[PDB]
Amino acid sequence: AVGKNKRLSKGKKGQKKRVVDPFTRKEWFDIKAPSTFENRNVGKTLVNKSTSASDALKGRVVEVCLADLQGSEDHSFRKIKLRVDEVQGKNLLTNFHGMDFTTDKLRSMVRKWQTLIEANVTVKTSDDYVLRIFAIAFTRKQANQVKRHSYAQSSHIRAIRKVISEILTKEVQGSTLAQLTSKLIPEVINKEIENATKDIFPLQNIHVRKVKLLKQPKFDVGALMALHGEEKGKKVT
Template sequence: MSRERVKDSWSAKKWFTVLAPTYFGNVEIGLTPADRPEKVIGRVMEATLYDITGDFSLIHVKLYFRIIDVSGEVAQTEFYGHEFTRDYLKSLVRRGTSKVDGIFDVVTKDGRALRVYPVAFTINRIKTSQEKIIRNVMGEVVEKKAEQLNYGEYAQEVVLGKIASEIYNLARKIVPLRKCEVWKTKPIKVRAKTVETLRAETQATA
């Protein structure tokens, strides 16, 4: 492709301002180029919780937003998962302690499915039986909150640490905990029948 054709291709494009969803304050999270509005639909943008809140201590939280609509030159998004940086996760590990991981598939009140990854760090090393109890607490909390909240509300409570705080307050009654986080979430695609199955499983464990 000639240099002139490349130049013409770029001159035909314009920049769209991308906003976080309303449940994250409609904050501007970036710009994305396209020659037609429909071409930006489905693109996934990355930001940090620092970009949303202005709190530098939250820069380790990476957020993903998928563009779902365009009005004029403004693109609207929805939450598309989050994760902590590897360096931050490594900094939480201590010698002589235990790390308890969980992975749970949940369905929110409005029928959206997410895979949720909580983690707890203990003050001292604990038994396998205690790890199992903590993991059960994690599952109960993330599933119960999903039943109560719609997708946007759930995303907000996960990212801002409210769900992790609830897990911490319950699990520390079992063993002393140093920290509890939900370090990752990601949307998952499930069929309607699977959604019903997930809901039934959640209600059975409630």
């Protein structure tokens, strides 16, 4: 309420005058994604020009939908987090930071008259990257089923959780973080779980609900350059 009848406030007494457009000193910066993604171009960001600029850039986290990175609407419904790690000539070299799905779906999949199964595991990659994985799967009815619901016994639930628990540990331990992301895009992890859990009970909508990055090793620029696949200056004549 900027109206006149709106009563005066104490804070209104002291008002710093606006003497700078902050974006006069801002400078744009272009983000690039790791090589595992098809579309490396993922936009740009802005920071105050160095008096340094790199400090504010390091540790920056950008979240984006997979569809933009893979150019497929079969990934319009998944989201990835990328963190800035290295800066070179206005280009940002990022590394995978996390993955999560959109809220609207999680409401969409969750429906009445079945059982919700969730499993979680804490595990480290071969790169000493400690991550936490969340997996979601639902029971389904058979083709000739006549019962209205498809509830599964808790003994089955514990059996399914163990199978989901053991498997998720297997891939993460026997793979690197960059390799681990490479499996996420073709959603390969889900289809084992269907097959491994196939005999126990028929499931549906099997997904790795979320991925969290708990701990990171000592940073290695040499590795990061490899994941992204130096430059002499111009003389002031």
